[PDB]
Ligand binder design. Structure first.
Ligand SMILES: *[C@@H]1O[C@H](CO)[C@@H](O)[C@H](O)[C@H]1NC(C)=O
Ligand SMILES: *[C@@H]1O[C@H](CO)[C@@H](O)[C@H](O)[C@H]1NC(C)=O
Ligand SMILES: [Ca+2]
Length: 427
């Protein structure tokens, strides 16, 4: 049980999970992860996937919950985003909502589909504008009152005004507006309850690029909502992610986000972190490797051993850079293109270990770094843009180490410059 944000997560078949824009549903002790299948690197509709698990980590892919229909707004030339599914007790029916759009995002509708079983397949009922207004990024929140009253959370009015509106008793349509934040430019919403209070997590509108996601709280869905506050250090842009789903977990929650990769959408990653409420304000716990016990409502952060890149052995043209965003105030630059750094005396008990690479990449585009263990064949690790040359994020790589001391060499045999390497943490 290791949740490793940024890694290529695979289902029980060993295939990369394709469930972007997550919606989670719990039925009894089984969890259902619905999402966008982007396996052909398209922004257009291929499927709403359905994966099941009892532990939130080992996901078994079922038949797709929603499939395209030519000549409708759920054709393979249209947009189906951010699916969400809730169970209607009155009708014994699962109801899926999603953002339904054209490829230019000019239609701004919701779509609804229904099924008698959690993975369906679902039957599409049509798309519409809620109360006649725009809806783009959306979520569905189901309260725990007696009626299990449900709400659409949505970016409206050309993304400018954020709305919460109550659904009818069938969950088929929006009946009344409940809250509006005019001019808020919020998207990617989700709500999770905590000690009877409602917590809204949302991003701002920066297109595909990540931005600092925010939390708001209220004692009623009608508000008043608190003023936005950060869930993560602002410079990290939510640790390079965008909110997708906020799952309750005991007295805390799990932040489930997407790391969108526009040039390779099917390789967009899943950024899941504990959302810790112990201070009364929710905050992402930046845990490169953590474990979850969904039955206990608990999480456990793995401990690792840190090695500073600047304490490694540089070869060729690599150099030491100084900056306030780096651990130890220093990083190794000019890696790749003839510069290397080798971190020696990496202790291990043997076997396979997750290693987090902390780097800064001030480009607008990705870099990568070659990684070789004890002189073995290199693997190439993608290094997203980090937000600035003085902003560090981490990405994980699983390395086979030997008992005793090990060496890890970065930047050998690549023509391009890698990102600047701050440190590594070996878990
Ligand atoms: C949904 O509810 C609204 C407001 O109550 C109503 O005007 C509308 O006819 C209903 N149906 C649809 C498809 O919007
Ligand atoms: C590695 O990074 C360079 C840019 O520095 C890029 O041109 C190249 O396509 C990347 N390689 C892979 C496999 O992504
Ligand atoms: Ca450092």
């Amino acid at each position: 049980n290791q949740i490793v944000s940024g890694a290529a997560w695979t289902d029980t078949a060993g295939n990369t999970i394709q469930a972007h824009g997550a919606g989670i549903l719990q039925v009894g002790s089984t969890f259902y992860w619905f999402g966008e299948d982007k396996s052909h690197n398209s922004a257009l509709f291929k499927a709403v996937s359905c994966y099941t698990s009892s532990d939130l980590v080992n996901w078994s892919r079922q038949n797709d919950a929603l499939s395209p229909i030519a000549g409708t707004m759920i054709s393979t030339s249209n947009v189906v985003e951010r699916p969400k599914v809730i169970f209607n007790q009155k009708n014994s029916e699962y109801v899926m909502w999603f953002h339904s759009d054209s490829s230019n995002y000019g239609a701004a509708m919701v779509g609804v589909a229904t099924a008698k079983t959690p993975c369906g397949p679902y039957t599409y009922k049509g798309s519409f504008k809620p109360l006649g207004a725009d809806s783009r990024d959306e979520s569905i929140f189901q309260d725990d009152d007696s009626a299990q009253t449900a709400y659409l959370l949505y970016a409206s009015d050309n993304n400018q005004n954020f709305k919460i509106s109550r659904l009818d008793a069938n969950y088929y349509n929006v009946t009344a507006q409940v809250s509006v934040m005019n001019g808020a430019t919020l998207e990617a919403p989700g709500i999770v309850k905590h000690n009877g209070e409602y917590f809204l997590i949302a991003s701002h509108t920066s297109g595909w690029a990540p931005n600092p996601n925010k939390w708001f709280s209220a004692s009623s869905l009608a508000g008043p909502w608190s003023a936005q506050q950060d869930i993560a250090p602002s410079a990290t842009r939510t640790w390079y992610s965008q909110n997708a789903f906020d799952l309750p977990l005991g007295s805390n929650a799990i932040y489930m986000g997407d790391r969108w990769r526009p040039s390779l959408l099917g390789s967009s990653r899943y950024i899941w972190y504990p959302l810790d409420f112990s201070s009364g304000a929710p905050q992402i716990v930046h845990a490169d490797v953590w474990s979850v016990n969904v039955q206990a409502g608990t999480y456990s952060v793995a401990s690792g051993t840190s090695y500073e890149a600047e304490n490694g052995q540089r070869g060729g043209s690599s150099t030491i850079l100084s900056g306030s965003g780096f651990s130890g105030g220093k990083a190794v630059g000019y890696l790749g293109h003839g510069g290397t750094v080798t971190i020696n005396n990496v202790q291990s008990n043997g076997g396979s270990h997750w290693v987090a690479l902390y780097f800064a990449n001030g480009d607008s585009t990705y870099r990568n770094v070659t990684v070789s263990v004890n002189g073995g064949p290199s693997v190439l690790v993608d290094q997203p843009d980090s937000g600035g040359g003085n902003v560090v994020i981490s990405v994980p790589v699983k390395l086979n180490l030997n008992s005793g001391e090990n060496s890890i060499t970065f930047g050998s045999g690549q023509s391009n410059y890698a990102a600047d390497l701050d440190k590594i943490i070996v878990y």
